[PDB]
Design a protein around this nucleic acid. Structure first.
Lengths: 116, 78, 93, 136, 57
RNA sequence: GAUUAUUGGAGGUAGAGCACUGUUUGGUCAGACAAACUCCGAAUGCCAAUUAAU
RNA sequence: AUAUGUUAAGUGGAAAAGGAUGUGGCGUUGCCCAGACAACUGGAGUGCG
RNA sequence: GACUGGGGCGGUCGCCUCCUAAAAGGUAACGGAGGCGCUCAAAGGUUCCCUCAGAAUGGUUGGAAAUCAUUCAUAGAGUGU
RNA sequence: UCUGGUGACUAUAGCAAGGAGGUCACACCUGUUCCCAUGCCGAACACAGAAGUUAAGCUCCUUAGCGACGAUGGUAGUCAACUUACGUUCCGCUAGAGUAGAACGUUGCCAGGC
């Protein structure tokens, strides 16, 4: 192969010259795998993580292919995040094209109270 | 015989205008340069023709970050 | 054979080094196992009467405060216009 | 006639001639050398004349390594001219020595032959040299 | 206090920094004097012009 | 306003070195040269703190 | 005046490449009691006419 | 018309970058070495992805530099002038 | 601690040869029914996913050959001073570049499951 993860960190580093905002515009990480999708809200004030979702727990990831999770894993943050007291987020692509599972999570996040 | 030479451009005053540690105001010019010898840092904006200046008014620092690269930052409280 | 040195204590200026080499003695330093950077003086007329018995790579027994700490000759420092020796590096084995 | 093929600039500033030699103080190939003790320029005609003088007395029974080369060119303007209005063309090529630098080396010949073979070349060079053998 | 200083050599023929330093110590003419207590600042100004003045206790 | 003492920082001279651009002697190894070469790089000077002493 | 060593050219009181058994200091070597170097008596080897 | 190591004759006059310029800026000579008096309707704005020169091996041998694939590369290509 | 995300100290973290491991996960891997993709190509970016394996990647460990880091000691320069014209000397500060010894197979932050 051509190091599928080592090319993403090359693409992620050129996304994130701008987007590293703090304390009212936090990032919202995205990541993928062959099986899952991971996400967490962070901001760069020497390390603060506010909410962290996943798709490996005993709540989801018992269901069909990859996307009805990734539309309903957006609301796993979007339930917790505004109930932690966050609003006015910024989202990164994480190195991926805004498409498919990543396009599903972003649109589903602001439909249930995580405004942009 | 003759000379084909002489003929120079005059000058452009091109160096550090403020120094490390002093209170600079909201629009002071902090460096004049060709290219980016010294990068813009935080609360510092790189202008067109690469002459980096300050944005919020506070102290200045010239700080190093890489192997052979440098940056200029401005911090708020004095 | 073996040298027999003293300890060059304190630290002194370049004129006192320049008043030292007229008496013949060449400064040196010793490092290595447990020696921890002692500074000596080496007499050049006596230091060459050692080299023609053990070689340019031999083993000597340098007495730094009556401690024959069995050093080797690592580095010269030479001046070709005046034909002397300027600084010698010993390492303890 | 020792000169470089191409130089990036034909008119250079004059080299500095005070201090002591940068490097090239020790005999490293041969067995007997000729180190200068005074500073001067040498202008590549007085190396054609001190090389051949060493060659004849040796009867070509050894090797000769010259360890300097004129890199820097030096200018001059023709006679009966006024000052200024330019800078003159290249006349020749110089090489700077400083006291300590080995000039010549020999190898493959005896000592008492080479000591009377380097004297025939120091009288065609300006500087005061002496006879240095190898580091032992 | 201590460190009685005295100006002996004059400032006629000396640079612009070796005249400002002498005027800092309070030395006007030849064979003037001051009495100033020892410091890291005063005892650093003395070797600036220690070829001019004489310092004594 | 000036002067040192302590402190921070900008910058590529002297010197030195060939890692680059050109020069160069003897068999990848040993050696050399540089105003318009630099992996490096002082001594001083310069701008400052709003800190103490004259 | 004093305590110590150096210079013999008027050096001090005009300047170089090179030459030089002038003289004083600091070191290093090889022969020397079988008494040494110098003079002194009877091996294709160093200049000669 | 003026500068001009007397005047004439030759040369040069404004803007740009380097060196002399002495590690802040500044700094002269008829000192050393080059350009400019324009060009782009995409070679401008923004968004999403890709990384180069050459070297070496192989084969219609187009010297492996026409085109063609693999390694090695640390910036040795390129950036309207 | 032990794995994964994620920024920091930024070759003392690197590069290269060896050696070990895998339902917890990351991968490798099969597919084109569709959104989506090639200026040639499911190689890639997407997208579906019973099965197939530790081989390369990543992960852990050790060897210091290469790169990086690097004292003390001395020299080169040099601000100030004193004679001096000599390709200078003597005295007092500061202190290089190269070279020897050596440090070195990373020290840590925060949320998530063991």
């Amino acid at each position: 192969k051509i190091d599928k993860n080592k090319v993403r960190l090359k693409r992620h580093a050129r996304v994130r010259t701008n987007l590293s905002g703090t304390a009212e515009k936090p990032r919202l990480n995205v990541y993928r795998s062959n099986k899952h999708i991971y996400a967490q809200i962070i901001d760069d004030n020497k390390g603060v993580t506010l909410a962290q979702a996943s798709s490996k727990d005993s709540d989801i990831a018992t269901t069909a292919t990859k996307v009805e999770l990734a539309t309903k894993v957006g609301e796993a943050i979007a339930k917790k995040a505004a109930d932690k007291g966050i609003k006015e987020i910024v989202f990164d692509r994480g190195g991926y094209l805004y498409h498919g599972r990543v396009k599903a999570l972003a649109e589903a996040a602001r439909e249930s109270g995580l405004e942009f | 015989s003759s000379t084909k030479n002489g003929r120079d451009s005059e000058s452009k005053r091109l160096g550090a205008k403020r120094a490390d540690g002093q209170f600079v105001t909201g629009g002071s010019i902090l460096y004049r340069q060709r290219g980016t010898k010294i990068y813009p840092g935080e609360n510092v904006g790189r202008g067109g023709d690469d002459t980096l200046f300050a944005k919020i008014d506070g102290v200045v620092k010239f700080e190093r970050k890489g192997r052979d690269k440098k940056q200029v930052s401005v911090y708020a409280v004095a | 054979a073996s040298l027999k040195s003293i300890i060059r204590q304190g630290k002194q200026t370049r004129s006192d080094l320049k008043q030292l080499r007229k008496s013949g003695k060449v400064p040196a330093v010793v490092y290595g196992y447990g020696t921890k950077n002692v500074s000596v003086k080496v007499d050049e007329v006596e230091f060459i009467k050692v080299i023609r018995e053990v070689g340019r790579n031999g083993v000597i027994e340098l007495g730094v405060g009556s401690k024959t700490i069995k050093v080797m000759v690592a580095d010269y420092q030479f001046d070709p216009l005046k034909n002397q020796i300027t600084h010698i590096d010993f390492l303890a084995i | 006639m020792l000169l470089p093929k191409r130089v990036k600039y034909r008119r250079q500033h004059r080299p500095k001639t005070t201090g002591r030699s940068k490097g090239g103080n020790y005999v490293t190939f041969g067995e007997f050398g000729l180190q200068a003790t005074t500073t001067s320029w040498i202008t590549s005609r007085q190396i054609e004349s001190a090389r051949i003088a060493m060659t004849r007395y040796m009867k070509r029974g050894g090797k000769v390594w010259i360890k300097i080369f004129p890199h820097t060119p030096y200018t001059k303007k023709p006679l009966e001219v006024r000052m200024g209005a330019g800078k003159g063309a290249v006349e020749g090529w110089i090489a700077v020595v400083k006291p300590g630098r080995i000039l010549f080396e020999v190898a493959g010949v005896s000592e008492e032959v080479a000591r009377e073979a380097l004297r025939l070349a120091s009288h065609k060079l300006p500087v005061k040299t002496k006879f240095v053998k190898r580091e032992e | 206090a201590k460190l009685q200083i005295t100006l002996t050599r004059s400032v006629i023929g000396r640079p612009e920094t070796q005249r400002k330093t002498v005027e800092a110590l309070g030395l006007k003419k030849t064979n003037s004097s001051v009495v100033v207590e020892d410091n890291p600042a005063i005892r650093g100004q003395i070797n600036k012009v220690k070829h001019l003045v004489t310092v004594e206790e």
